[PDB]
């Protein structure tokens, strides 16, 4: 099945998921000189005061921090969005080395990692129905650079030892995702897709300009996770990023001058 290695990595995905070569695939390179300021964009509204995390799971590709999405508790609205999008999970993509790991790039620059906060459009009732729609998802993407530690990340780092291998999960209640946000909500936005199979073209991407800083010790702990399951040969979970895809007939808009 699909993964990130020589034989089942991104260059193979199109055989099981032909939309890999579609018209609105993600990630993309953000050319900052080509992205036009759009004064009709709104500030993003990120309302995470009532977010209820439940669990963390190693799915064999990354780890997911999952939320209770059965009530309007943690929502994204405003920005380029019409309506209200509910947080369902977050996860990261990261590298084997600090010079790579992000999926979007900025003027070809790769960051050490990228956080994706995944939200679904409540007009479609559930996440499964939302991913059948071209406006079903909104993903808030946040770059990570290595430097000072991010205090708000440490509870996630410290639980990873308990979910080393594929299929492991741990209770993960009362985690506050506001601690993962940078100061500024300035962003770029474009229409795109999931960056993992099934690569569905449902996503309004909202990519923050300001990275957060994490410490080298924090990212090193991500890199001790495993893609394999318990009692299988160890394959470190690193380099779980898809490279940039063709922009095609799309425009990247900036919320800021
Ligand atoms: C599972 C998922 C949902 C939305 C975006 C991305 S990159 N992923 O992986
Ligand atoms: Na849920
Ligand atoms: Zn992702």
């Amino acid at each position: 099945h699909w993964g990130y290695g020589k034989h089942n990595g991104p260059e193979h995905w199109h055989k099981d998921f032909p939309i890999a070569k579609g018209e609105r695939q993600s990630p993309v390179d953000i050319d900052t000189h080509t992205a036009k300021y759009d004064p009709s964009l709104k500030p993003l509204s990120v309302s995470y005061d009532q977010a209820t995390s439940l669990r963390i799971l190693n799915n064999g590709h990354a780890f997911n921090v999952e939320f209770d999405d059965s009530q309007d508790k943690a929502v994204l609205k405003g920005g380029p969005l019409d309506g209200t999008y509910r947080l369902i999970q977050f996860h990261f993509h990261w590298g084997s080395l600090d010079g790579q790991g992000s999926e979007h790039t900025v003027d070809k620059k790769k960051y050490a990692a990228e956080l994706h906060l995944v939200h679904w459009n409540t007009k479609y009732g559930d996440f499964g129905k939302a991913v059948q729609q071209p406006d079903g998802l909104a993903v808030l993407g946040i770059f990570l650079k290595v430097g000072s530690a991010k205090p708000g990340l440490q509870k996630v780092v410290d639980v990873l030892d308990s979910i080393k291998t594929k299929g492991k999960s741990a209770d993960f209640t009362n985690f506050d995702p506001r601690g993962l946000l940078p100061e500024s909500l300035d962003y770029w936005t474009y229409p795109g897709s999931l960056t993992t199979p099934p690569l569905l073209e449902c996503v309004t991407w909202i990519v923050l300009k300001e990275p957060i800083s994490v410490s080298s010790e924090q990212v090193l702990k991500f890199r001790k996770l495993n893609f394999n399951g318990e009692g299988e040969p160890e394959e470190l979970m690193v380099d779980n990023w898809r490279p940039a895809q063709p922009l095609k007939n799309r425009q990247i808009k900036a919320s800021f001058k």
Side-chain angles (χ1 to χ4, degrees):
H1 226 359
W2 72 267
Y4 298 93
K6 180 166 264 153
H7 303 274
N8 64 358
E11 302 316 307
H12 296 271
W13 296 346
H14 67 99
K15 292 174 277 174
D16 276 334
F17 309 92
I19 203 176
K21 293 186 191 278
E23 295 307 299
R24 51 174 284 183
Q25 287 293 289
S26 288
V28 301
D29 183 51
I30 296 165
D31 180 337
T32 61
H33 290 109
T34 299
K36 194 188 175 175
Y37 169 54
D38 186 348
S40 75
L41 286 172
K42 305 161 185 186
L44 198 58
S45 172
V46 184
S47 293
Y48 291 169
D49 45 284
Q50 306 285 137
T52 306
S53 62
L54 294 180
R55 189 172 76 139
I56 189 171
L57 170 70
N58 176 334
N59 70 1
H61 304 114
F63 61 88
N64 297 341
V65 174
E66 298 158 353
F67 285 79
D68 175 8
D69 70 346
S70 69
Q71 279 164 264
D72 262 337
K73 264 184 204 293
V75 303
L76 184 66
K77 61 190 261 281
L81 311 169
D82 284 337
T84 291
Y85 293 67
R86 199 177 283 181
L87 176 64
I88 178 173
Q89 53 111 301
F90 68 76
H91 59 278
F92 299 83
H93 303 266
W94 65 88
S96 55
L97 301 170
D98 295 347
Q100 61 184 36
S102 66
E103 292 201 310
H104 297 89
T105 58
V106 177
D107 297 332
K108 305 291 176 101
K109 177 186 168 71
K110 295 174 166 91
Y111 290 86
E114 185 175 327
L115 164 65
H116 288 166
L117 300 128
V118 179
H119 311 72
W120 55 270
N121 194 330
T122 56
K123 78 189 259 175
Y124 298 124
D126 65 62
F127 175 85
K129 177 65 42 139
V131 305
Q132 297 179 51
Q133 317 303 148
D135 61 344
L137 298 185
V139 184
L140 183 64
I142 298 181
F143 301 119
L144 282 62
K145 69 182 187 179
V146 176
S148 303
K150 193 66 164 170
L153 181 63
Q154 191 61 36
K155 295 196 289 192
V156 171
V157 169
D158 284 325
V159 85
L160 304 178
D161 281 342
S162 78
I163 58 153
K164 183 166 174 189
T165 49
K166 175 172 56 190
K168 298 201 153 295
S169 67
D171 292 325
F172 201 65
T173 54
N174 302 104
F175 181 79
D176 191 337
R178 286 174 301 184
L180 296 180
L181 302 180
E183 292 179 0
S184 186
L185 294 179
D186 285 344
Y187 63 85
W188 296 284
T189 185
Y190 76 95
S193 68
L194 306 201
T195 65
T196 47
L199 307 168
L200 300 175
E201 290 182 336
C202 323
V203 180
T204 299
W205 277 99
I206 297 171
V207 179
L208 292 194
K209 171 185 186 167
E210 185 186 326
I212 56 167
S213 286
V214 304
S215 67
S216 181
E217 298 85 352
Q218 288 183 314
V219 75
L220 278 163
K221 285 173 188 190
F222 285 26
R223 300 177 186 137
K224 292 190 91 207
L225 291 166
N226 282 188
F227 288 131
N228 53 279
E230 185 183 4
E232 287 160 23
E234 182 174 47
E235 188 77 60
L236 291 174
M237 185 177 282
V238 295
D239 293 319
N240 52 3
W241 53 271
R242 186 196 199 190
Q245 302 297 309
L247 190 60
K248 294 189 172 163
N249 176 225
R250 294 175 289 177
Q251 295 197 137
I252 306 179
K253 293 282 201 179
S255 79
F256 58 91
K257 264 193 188 105

mmCIF file of all heavy atoms in Angstrom, residues 21 30 39 88 95 115 118 142 147 190 207 209 225 247:
data_model
loop_
_atom_site.group_PDB
_atom_site.id
_atom_site.type_symbol
_atom_site.label_atom_id
_atom_site.label_comp_id
_atom_site.label_asym_id
_atom_site.label_seq_id
_atom_site.Cartn_x
_atom_site.Cartn_y
_atom_site.Cartn_z
ATOM 1 N N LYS A 21 -2.630 13.282 -10.483
ATOM 2 C CA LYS A 21 -2.187 14.121 -11.599
ATOM 3 C C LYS A 21 -3.288 15.049 -12.015
ATOM 4 O O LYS A 21 -3.309 15.506 -13.184
ATOM 5 C CB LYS A 21 -1.861 13.207 -12.825
ATOM 6 C CG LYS A 21 -0.668 12.334 -12.554
ATOM 7 C CD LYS A 21 -0.312 11.580 -13.870
ATOM 8 C CE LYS A 21 0.687 10.511 -13.650
ATOM 9 N NZ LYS A 21 2.026 11.108 -13.624
ATOM 10 N N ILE A 30 4.824 28.323 -3.102
ATOM 11 C CA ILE A 30 4.200 29.658 -2.977
ATOM 12 C C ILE A 30 5.286 30.632 -3.465
ATOM 13 O O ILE A 30 6.253 30.899 -2.758
ATOM 14 C CB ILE A 30 3.743 29.909 -1.535
ATOM 15 C CG1 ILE A 30 2.671 28.909 -1.180
ATOM 16 C CG2 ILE A 30 3.257 31.433 -1.437
ATOM 17 C CD1 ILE A 30 2.402 28.838 0.407
ATOM 18 N N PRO A 39 -7.451 42.531 -1.172
ATOM 19 C CA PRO A 39 -8.016 43.336 -0.057
ATOM 20 C C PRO A 39 -9.459 42.902 0.243
ATOM 21 O O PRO A 39 -10.042 43.336 1.289
ATOM 22 C CB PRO A 39 -7.973 44.799 -0.642
ATOM 23 C CG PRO A 39 -8.239 44.559 -2.083
ATOM 24 C CD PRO A 39 -7.291 43.338 -2.393
ATOM 25 N N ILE A 88 -11.350 18.757 13.112
ATOM 26 C CA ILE A 88 -11.456 17.322 13.339
ATOM 27 C C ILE A 88 -10.123 16.703 13.759
ATOM 28 O O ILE A 88 -10.145 15.805 14.615
ATOM 29 C CB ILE A 88 -12.066 16.621 12.127
ATOM 30 C CG1 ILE A 88 -12.136 15.068 12.369
ATOM 31 C CG2 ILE A 88 -11.270 16.906 10.818
ATOM 32 C CD1 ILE A 88 -12.914 14.297 11.208
ATOM 33 N N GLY A 95 10.779 16.064 8.115
ATOM 34 C CA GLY A 95 11.925 15.487 7.385
ATOM 35 C C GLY A 95 12.822 14.589 8.228
ATOM 36 O O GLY A 95 12.683 14.495 9.447
ATOM 37 N N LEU A 115 2.609 21.743 9.994
ATOM 38 C CA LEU A 115 1.443 21.355 10.754
ATOM 39 C C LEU A 115 0.182 21.635 9.855
ATOM 40 O O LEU A 115 0.040 22.721 9.280
ATOM 41 C CB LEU A 115 1.400 22.249 12.042
ATOM 42 C CG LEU A 115 0.052 22.294 12.824
ATOM 43 C CD1 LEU A 115 -0.271 20.959 13.391
ATOM 44 C CD2 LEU A 115 0.259 23.267 14.045
ATOM 45 N N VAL A 118 -6.949 20.347 10.317
ATOM 46 C CA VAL A 118 -7.953 19.945 9.301
ATOM 47 C C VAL A 118 -9.354 20.231 9.793
ATOM 48 O O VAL A 118 -9.703 19.784 10.910
ATOM 49 C CB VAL A 118 -7.827 18.454 9.020
ATOM 50 C CG1 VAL A 118 -8.889 18.010 7.965
ATOM 51 C CG2 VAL A 118 -6.406 18.080 8.571
ATOM 52 N N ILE A 142 0.853 25.396 8.842
ATOM 53 C CA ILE A 142 1.744 26.272 9.675
ATOM 54 C C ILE A 142 3.105 25.605 9.516
ATOM 55 O O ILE A 142 3.328 24.423 9.852
ATOM 56 C CB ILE A 142 1.273 26.297 11.114
ATOM 57 C CG1 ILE A 142 -0.128 26.875 11.190
ATOM 58 C CG2 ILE A 142 2.300 27.129 12.007
ATOM 59 C CD1 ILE A 142 -0.707 26.956 12.714
ATOM 60 N N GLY A 147 14.634 26.094 16.099
ATOM 61 C CA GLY A 147 15.336 27.164 16.843
ATOM 62 C C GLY A 147 14.904 27.018 18.322
ATOM 63 O O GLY A 147 15.200 25.980 18.946
ATOM 64 N N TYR A 190 -5.151 29.205 -1.496
ATOM 65 C CA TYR A 190 -5.402 28.673 -2.850
ATOM 66 C C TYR A 190 -6.251 27.411 -2.704
ATOM 67 O O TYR A 190 -6.291 26.800 -1.645
ATOM 68 C CB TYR A 190 -4.066 28.424 -3.612
ATOM 69 C CG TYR A 190 -3.364 27.198 -3.141
ATOM 70 C CD1 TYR A 190 -3.557 25.992 -3.822
ATOM 71 C CD2 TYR A 190 -2.626 27.181 -1.949
ATOM 72 C CE1 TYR A 190 -2.964 24.843 -3.349
ATOM 73 C CE2 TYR A 190 -2.026 26.007 -1.485
ATOM 74 C CZ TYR A 190 -2.203 24.839 -2.196
ATOM 75 O OH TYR A 190 -1.630 23.655 -1.769
ATOM 76 N N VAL A 207 -2.362 28.967 4.364
ATOM 77 C CA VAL A 207 -0.943 28.723 4.797
ATOM 78 C C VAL A 207 -0.442 29.967 5.474
ATOM 79 O O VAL A 207 -0.376 30.992 4.821
ATOM 80 C CB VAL A 207 -0.093 28.288 3.627
ATOM 81 C CG1 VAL A 207 1.342 28.087 4.125
ATOM 82 C CG2 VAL A 207 -0.691 27.004 3.031
ATOM 83 N N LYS A 209 1.960 32.780 6.909
ATOM 84 C CA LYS A 209 3.272 33.239 6.562
ATOM 85 C C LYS A 209 4.331 33.065 7.659
ATOM 86 O O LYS A 209 5.489 32.790 7.371
ATOM 87 C CB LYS A 209 3.172 34.699 6.122
ATOM 88 C CG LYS A 209 4.536 35.359 5.935
ATOM 89 C CD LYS A 209 4.440 36.838 5.617
ATOM 90 C CE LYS A 209 5.845 37.316 5.302
ATOM 91 N NZ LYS A 209 5.863 38.679 4.666
ATOM 92 N N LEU A 225 9.634 8.166 15.810
ATOM 93 C CA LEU A 225 8.444 7.344 15.512
ATOM 94 C C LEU A 225 8.776 6.378 14.429
ATOM 95 O O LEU A 225 9.777 6.459 13.768
ATOM 96 C CB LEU A 225 7.279 8.201 15.034
ATOM 97 C CG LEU A 225 6.693 9.090 16.140
ATOM 98 C CD1 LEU A 225 5.795 10.158 15.531
ATOM 99 C CD2 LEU A 225 5.868 8.235 17.175
ATOM 100 N N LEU A 247 1.171 23.990 -10.319
ATOM 101 C CA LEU A 247 0.156 24.988 -9.929
ATOM 102 C C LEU A 247 -1.025 24.931 -10.888
ATOM 103 O O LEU A 247 -2.167 25.075 -10.452
ATOM 104 C CB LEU A 247 0.760 26.418 -9.861
ATOM 105 C CG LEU A 247 -0.149 27.434 -9.236
ATOM 106 C CD1 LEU A 247 -0.534 27.090 -7.813
ATOM 107 C CD2 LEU A 247 0.634 28.855 -9.233
#
